[PDB]
Structures are given as structure tokens and as C-alpha cells.
Symmetry: C3
Subunit: 230 residues, 3 copies
């Protein structure tokens, strides 16, 4: 393809596809109802990402947005992916710690605001206003990270030790990886335009595969996803 | 801004923002799991409205629709707000009366039809057909109001007296305020065009703040949102 | 109207409308909470389809997509219908057999991928790539049909005999009817273009009414939707 970033979109498609197939085969035969929930959530995540990476590779998930006096290539398909995959990742963490329903609704709702405002920012034609939406989205992200540390960590330590241990690892992975996304957006083609689109696409591919397939490998190898039984 | 209705969009943004912050601080420290559910639902409502009012203020949430031989300004962001906030408001009422799952699904589904058909009507280019969609949406609204009076009132009176009392007030607020929306649409810029857009925008701002922040102030001050405990 | 397929859109609108009204009246007075769930899910299905058939009849739900060097009429409103009605139909089947939550999430998620990739395929401007999306969507469909036969049939036979019996019939109806959709798409205006749009529209109308109103008549006449009580 004639876009230099094609190679990273192709690799991302392949890695999300391979991760989906691996999780699908690994979950074959699992009969524990708690483990089935985690396999279902965790396999859906790279499956959705696979479809949206493929849409970017083939050019469907790209649009041109005028701002700063240029026509700027915006990959809108990222937001369609993240709208569904980021609440699913949060549901994996919430189910692990048996979070109450009100906390789950708060997290999923804040996450929806985060991604939706990011999408508005990405498509906004007045340059200075793009950063207003970025700030609102980032505030929603900070709310999510606060709950994961000062609601979820406190509950986990009261549960089975393998649940506490696996939650603590996946919480730390999540906070580090998710915090990089607003930074890549700010310095890349959607924001200040300091990093070119080809490098930005590489960075999001590394983050996405780590936050989805890496995350899932840790979770689905854990004893924490099974009920305690004899 | 050069649009006369800007002042009402600005005030609406500010009031939804202030209401979100108030509910967020008030819900700090609440540990009762039932109360947490109500705080989460009720704080999300003005937070979503805040983002969509801001999108209208900055001009993102506006499009031009040709009908009647003119280019007509249609604020489409209202429907994106209401798609999520109106089912959340109904969930507050349904949880208060411990409604059965089938009734909740009926209400949320009718509400989705109401808002979705309103959006189609708002974007329809053949003038006479706009009113066909308005009629279908209004029928869905009447179904909702019927359930709130002839399903929900009957259940409430069988529950704790503080639940019955708070439900009856919030039901009455809801029926009065929600019934005004189809009337404003019909006589305003989306419909017959008798009331100008600046006044229409004022009317929806008053209704929205009352139906979201007013509603939430009544609910979150009530004893009904807490479990009965010693 | 000047489109030859109008007659089938009109008939489909009428039949979905009549089926909605019939199910609404039949469900009046039902007080069993399990039966209420099934009436709510099953009445919503033709109600949503009614609105989307009407949008196609009036011309709102149609767009033109260039591919193969022509402007091709694509009825996009079908996908908006199916996005909501196909998971509702699967929920009817899953509730009947008391499926576990993980299996329900797998089914609904695969169904979302099926319809979303179908929509991307329908709107794709590069002709050969339309069939890549068709293949991905069809793979998701095959996953769904596998679960209905090799997860759901095995559970049903362990339940009440009237539940097993009604599930087996509705499963067979579902597999036969749903399998025809990818074939109609492939040979019709969205795909290879061998069957003209007027005949394609007839075929989808027959399938839709059978898969929604036919399905619902079988289910809502069954004893299986009521709890076992004295
Ligand atoms: C997990 C095991 C594998 C670990 C792998 C980690 C990779 C993640 C980071 C990649 C950034 C690469 C940056 C590449 C920078 C090239 C940009 C460039 O060409 O910049 C020069 C320009 O011409 C003038 O400034
Ligand atoms: C809660 C405590 C505060 C209560 C506040 C309630 C306000 C709600 C209603 C406002 C309608 C105002 C209508 C303003 C009409 C002005 C339109 C106008 O200018 O019309 C004249 C025109 O030039 C030729 O007909
Ligand atoms: C339930 C009881 C009622 C059962 C009813 C079942 C109907 C379903 C199938 C219809 C296909 C009809 C196909 C009509 C074909 C006409 C196309 C045509 O005109 O093709 C000739 C063309 O001019 C040169 O090839
Ligand atoms: C001027 C101020 C403007 C408005 C501020 C920016 C709005 C968007 C940002 C963040 C979303 C905040 C989180 C929304 C969800 C809160 C849920 C909540 O309150 O949950 C309580 C529950 O007890 C928990 O377990
Ligand atoms: C419990 C459930 C909670 C759910 C919480 C969800 C909150 C989402 C809020 C705001 C983002 C809205 C974003 C809307 C973006 C639409 C952009 C679009 O499609 O624009 C069309 C065109 O490109 C230009 O007119
Ligand atoms: C806890 C997780 C938080 C995650 C969110 C952290 C956000 C703030 C980070 C960086 C902003 C630094 C300033 C970037 C703006 C630079 C503007 C500019 O003009 O830069 C010129 C350029 O450096 C040469 O050409
Ligand atoms: C010609 C007729 C055309 C069709 C009519 C217009 C369709 C749209 C209008 C209203 C939605 C109706 C409500 C949809 C949901 C009904 C749910 C239901 O039946 O719920 C039963 C349950 O027992 C409860 O607890
Ligand atoms: C339990 C879950 C129940 C959920 C019930 C939901 C029912 C929604 C039904 C119909 C409205 C569909 C509205 C679709 C509007 C799309 C308009 C649009 O985006 O148009 C694009 C462009 O502007 C022009 O081609
Ligand atoms: C229970 C809640 C129900 C809520 C829904 C109630 C709907 C009917 C209300 C009003 C319609 C009145 C007729 C409006 C149409 C007027 C058309 C016209 O030409 O008006 C000329 C104008 O009055 C001078 O220029
Ligand atoms: C190169 C390969 C590319 C990727 C493949 C194509 C992706 C889209 C197709 C099918 C969706 C598959 C189903 C997605 C949901 C799986 C859910 C699951 O694993 O559920 C386990 C649970 O135990 C159950 O009860
Ligand atoms: C538990 C919840 C699981 C939910 C699982 C859902 C999976 C959906 C995945 C992919 C399809 C995405 C389709 C996006 C299509 C948007 C097309 C569009 O609107 O295009 C705009 C314009 O026409 C051109 O730029
Ligand atoms: C279990 C359910 C599975 C459902 C899915 C089954 C998919 C495969 C079916 C048919 C493809 C047959 C080939 C169609 C392609 C024909 C291409 C062509 O050029 O046809 C010329 C035409 O026949 C004269 O003009
Ligand atoms: C699978 C993909 C993941 C986990 C993606 C996560 C994305 C975010 C945390 C995005 C956050 C953003 C902001 C906080 C500000 C605006 C830009 C966004 C959407 C990139
Ligand atoms: C927070 C906002 C609220 C509670 C908005 C409520 C909106 C409605 C009840 C809208 C109803 C409409 C009709 C019944 C007919 C068509 C026009 C609509 C969407 C305005
Ligand atoms: C009420 C409508 C129903 C039950 C519609 C069902 C539709 C499908 C099973 C569609 C499947 C498709 C594929 C498997 C491939 C691509 C084309 C689709 C969307 C037609």
C-alpha cells in the first residue's frame, strides 16, 4: 500500500488475529462458569481489534479532517475499537475483584465519556478546541485510574490471595499502558503533530497488542479465573 | 459566538458541569451498595449532558438539514445526549421500585425507539414525513408514561413508605417535564417553525436542567436510596 | 414510489406493524415475571424492524455506494435493525435454556461482529474487499450456529421437557433462516449482482417476517415461557 504506516497496521492485524485464535482454542473445553466469563470477555477484545485494524489496513477506517490549514489523515476506526474493547477490559478487572454494580456502572460510563470525547476531539476542525476535548477525556481517564487504585485495590486484598495477586499485576499493567495513550495522541498527528503518523501508528500498535493480548495472556494463565472448588 | 442561542448553550453547559461536580462530591464516601448505584446513575446523567451541551456551544453538534426550501440548523447532539441519559433516568425510577427485568427491558427499548425515531425525524428532508416520525416517537413516549403510572405506581405502594413517597414525586416530575419535549419540537425549528431557534434552545435548557439536575437533587437527598439497616 | 422494490418494503412495514400490535395485546395482563421477559424481548423485535422498514420505504434508509463503476443502491437501515434485533432473538433462545452469562456474552459479541462486518462490507468501495468482510461475518455466524447446537442443545435436554421441545424447534428455525441471509447478500446487489434488487428485497422480507414474527408466534404460544407453578 502507498501509506508508510501500512506495515504496522498489517502487523497489528496479524497479531490481533493470532491472539484471538490462541484464546479461542485455549478456552475450548473450559466448563467452569466463572472461567467461561473471563474467556468470553478476553477473547472478544482482540477479535474486535482485529476487525478494526483490518479496516485501517484496507483504508475504510481512515478519513481526512481539515485543521491547521491541511488535510489531516485521521484513523477513526481506533475509537470504534476502543469504545467496545476498553469497557470489556475494565469488566475483566471488575469481575476479578467482585466489584459492586454501582462501581462497574461508574467505570463503564466514565470510559464511554473518555472514548467519545476523544473521538470528538479527533474530528474537530478548530485546532485549539481539539485540546479542550483531550483535557475532558484525560480527566475521565484519571477518574478511572483513581477507582482502580482506591476502590479496587482495597477490595482485592480482602479476597482469595490468587485473586489479589493477579489483580495487582493487571492493575499495574493497565495504569502504565493506558496512561501512554493520551501522550501519543497529544504529540502525534491528532494533536501537536511533532511525531509523524508512521511512528504514531507503530506506538499505538505496541500499546494495543500489549494492553489486549499481553493482558489476556497474564489473566488466562491465572488460577484466579476459576471458582474455588475441590 | 455569532449564533443568538449561544447564551443558553453556555448557561446549560455551566449548569450541567456544576451539577456533575456537586453530585460527584456528595457521593464521595458513600459505601452503601444500593446508594452507590443511584449516585453512579445520577451523576453520569449531567456529565453526559455537559459534554453534549459543550459540543453544541462549540459548533460540533450542529448540522444543516434542507427542508421547506431552506437550510435549517439542527442540533443533532441533543439526540446523542438523550439516547444515553433518558434510559439512565428510567433506570433510577425502576431500581427505586425494584421493577422486574422484563419491565425494565420494555422501558429501555421503548425509550430507544423514542429517541431514535426523533433523530430520524430531525434529519428527514421531506417536510411532511418529519411529522410521521414525530407521531411514532410520541406513541413510544405514551407507552413509557403508561408503564410509569400503571406498572410502577402499583408496585411502589407495596414497598417501604419512603420509597413510595420519593417514587411518586419523581414520577410526577418526569411525566410533566418529559411531556413538554414533543411539544417544543413540534412548534420549534425541527417542526412547524413557529418559535424561533433561540427561544427553543432556552426552553430545552430549562427542561434539561430540571429533568436532570432537579430530578437528581430530589432523589439523592432521599432516604429511599439507602438500604434499610440498623 | 418510483423504486420497484417499494411494494415489498410496504408489505414488510405492514406485517412488522401488525405483528408488534398482536404481541403487545397478547402480553397484556401477563404477570408471571419469566413470561414478561419473553414478551418484552419478543415484542421489541418487530417494533424495531417496523421502524427500519418504514425508513427504507420513505427513502431515509437508502444510500448510494460507488463500486464496480456504478452507483449502487444500498439499504443501510437493514444493519441498524439487525444490530439490535439479532441479539434480542439470541437472548430469547439463551434465556429459554438458562445459559450461563459467559456464553451469552460470547453469542452477543459474535453477533455484533457479524452485523458490524456485514455493514462495513456493504459500504466498502473496493469491490474485491467486500467479499473479505462477507467471509469474516460468515465465520462469526458459524460460531453462533456452533454454540446453538453444541452448547445449547446439550443444556436444553437437561431441563423441563416443554423447554427442551420448544428450544429444539426454535433452534432449527433459527439455523435454517439465518443461514439464508449470507447467501442472499452474496448473490444480490451487495455482492455479485446476479439477483436484482427488487427480488432481493422480496427475499429479505420473507426471511425477516419468518425469523421475527414467525419465531415469536411459536415462542409466545409455548408453555415454556412460564415458570413452573401450581
Ligand atoms: C517487547 C520486545 C521488543 C521491544 C521493542 C520496543 C519498541 C517500542 C518503541 C518504538 C519506538 C521506535 C522509534 C523509531 C524512531 C524512528 C523515527 C525516525 O526516523 O526519526 C528520525 C527522523 O528521520 C529525524 O528526526
Ligand atoms: C425556576 C425559576 C425561574 C423561572 C423562569 C422560567 C422561564 C421559562 C420560560 C421561558 C420563556 C420566555 C419567553 C421569552 C419570549 C421572548 C420571545 C420574543 O422576543 O418574542 C417577541 C417577538 O419579538 C415577537 O413575537
Ligand atoms: C408462506 C406461504 C407463501 C409462500 C411463498 C414463498 C415465496 C418465497 C420466494 C419467492 C421467490 C419468487 C421469485 C420470483 C422470480 C421473478 C424474477 C423474474 O422476473 O425473473 C425473470 C427475469 O425476467 C429473467 O430471468
Ligand atoms: C466543569 C466540570 C465539568 C464536568 C466534569 C467533567 C465531566 C467528564 C469527566 C469525568 C467523568 C467523571 C465520572 C463520571 C461518573 C461518576 C460516577 C459516580 O459518581 O459514582 C459514584 C459511585 O458511588 C461509585 O461507586
Ligand atoms: C451506562 C451507559 C453509559 C454510556 C456513556 C456514553 C457517553 C458518551 C458521551 C459523549 C460522546 C458522544 C460522541 C458522539 C460522536 C458522534 C460523531 C459522529 O458520528 O459525527 C457525525 C459526523 O462525523 C459529524 O456530524
Ligand atoms: C498519569 C498519566 C497522565 C497522562 C497525561 C500527561 C499529559 C502531560 C504530558 C506532557 C505535556 C508536555 C507538553 C507538550 C506540548 C508541546 C507543545 C509544543 O509546541 O512543543 C514543541 C515541540 O516540543 C518542539 O517542536
Ligand atoms: C401500525 C403499528 C406500528 C407499530 C407500533 C409502533 C411501534 C413503536 C411505538 C411504540 C413502542 C411500543 C413498545 C415496545 C415494547 C413493548 C414491550 C412489551 O410488550 O413488554 C411486555 C412486558 O410484559 C412488560 O413488562
Ligand atoms: C434492549 C436494547 C433495545 C435497543 C432499542 C433501540 C431501537 C432503535 C431503533 C430505531 C432507530 C434507529 C436510528 C438510526 C439513526 C442513524 C442516522 C444516521 O446516522 O444517519 C447517517 C446519515 O446522517 C444519513 O445516512
Ligand atoms: C400527554 C402529553 C402529550 C404531548 C403531545 C401533545 C401533542 C398535541 C399538542 C399540540 C398540537 C396543536 C397544533 C399545532 C400545529 C399548528 C400548525 C399551524 O399551522 O399553526 C399555525 C400557527 O399556530 C400560527 O402561525
Ligand atoms: C486470522 C484470524 C482472525 C480472527 C478470527 C476472526 C474473528 C471474527 C470471527 C468470529 C468471532 C469469534 C467469536 C468471538 C467470541 C469468542 C468467545 C469465547 O471464547 O467464549 C468462550 C466461552 O467459554 C463460551 O462460553
Ligand atoms: C459485549 C459487547 C460486544 C459488542 C461487540 C461489537 C463489535 C463490533 C465490531 C466491529 C464493527 C464496527 C462497525 C463500524 C461501522 C461504522 C460505519 C460508519 O458509520 O461509517 C461512517 C461513514 O459512512 C464512513 O466513514
Ligand atoms: C451453513 C450455512 C452456510 C451459508 C453460506 C454458504 C456460502 C457458499 C454458497 C454459495 C457460493 C456459490 C458461488 C457463488 C459465486 C458465483 C460467482 C459468479 O460469477 O457467478 C456467475 C453466475 O452464477 C452466472 O452469471
Ligand atoms: C485496547 C486499547 C486500549 C486499552 C486503548 C486505550 C485508550 C485510551 C486510554 C485513550 C485515552 C485518550 C485520552 C485519555 C485523551 C484523548 C485521546 C484518547 C482517546 C487517546
Ligand atoms: C435529559 C433529557 C430528557 C429527559 C429528554 C427527554 C426527551 C424526550 C421525552 C423527547 C421526546 C420526543 C418525542 C416524544 C417526539 C419527537 C421529538 C422528541 C425526541 C423530542
Ligand atoms: C431479523 C433479522 C435477522 C434474523 C437477520 C439475520 C441476518 C444475518 C444472519 C446476516 C448475516 C450476514 C452474513 C453472515 C454475512 C454478510 C452479510 C450478512 C449481514 C447478511
Amino acid at each position: 500500500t502507498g501509506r508508510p504506516e501500512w506495515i504496522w497496521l498489517a502487523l497489528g492485524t496479524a497479531l490481533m488475529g493470532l491472539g484471538t485464535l490462541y484464546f479461542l482454542v485455549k478456552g475450548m473445553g473450559v466448563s467452569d462458569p466463572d472461567a467461561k466469563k473471563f474467556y468470553a470477555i478476553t477473547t472478544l477484545v482482540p477479535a474486535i481489534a482485529f476487525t478494526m485494524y483490518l479496516s485501517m489496513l484496507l483504508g475504510y477506517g481512515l478519513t481526512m479532517v481539515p485543521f491547521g490549514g491541511e488535510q489531516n489523515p485521521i484513523y477513526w476506526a481506533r475509537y470504534a475499537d476502543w469504545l467496545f474493547t476498553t469497557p470489556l477490559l475494565l469488566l475483566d478487572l471488575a469481575l476479578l475483584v467482585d466489584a459492586d454494580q454501582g462501581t462497574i456502572l461508574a467505570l463503564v460510563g466514565a470510559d464511554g465519556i473518555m472514548i467519545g470525547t476523544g473521538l470528538v476531539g479527533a474530528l474537530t476542525k478548530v485546532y485549539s478546541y481539539r485540546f479542550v476535548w483531550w483535557a475532558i477525556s484525560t480527566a475521565a481517564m484519571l477518574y478511572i485510574l483513581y477507582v482502580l487504585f482506591f476502590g479496587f485495590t482495597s477490595k482485592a486484598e480482602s479476597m482469595r490471595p490468587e485473586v489479589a495477586s493477579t489483580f495487582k499485576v493487571l492493575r499495574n499493567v493497565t495504569v502504565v499502558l493506558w496512561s501512554a495513550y493520551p501522550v501519543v495522541w497529544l504529540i502525534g498527528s491528532e494533536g501537536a503533530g511533532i511525531v509523524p503518523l508512521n511512528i504514531e501508528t507503530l506506538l499505538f500498535m505496541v500499546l494495543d497488542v500489549s494492553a489486549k493480548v499481553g493482558f489476556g495472556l497474564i489473566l488466562l494463565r491465572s488460577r484466579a479465573i476459576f471458582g474455588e472448588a475441590e
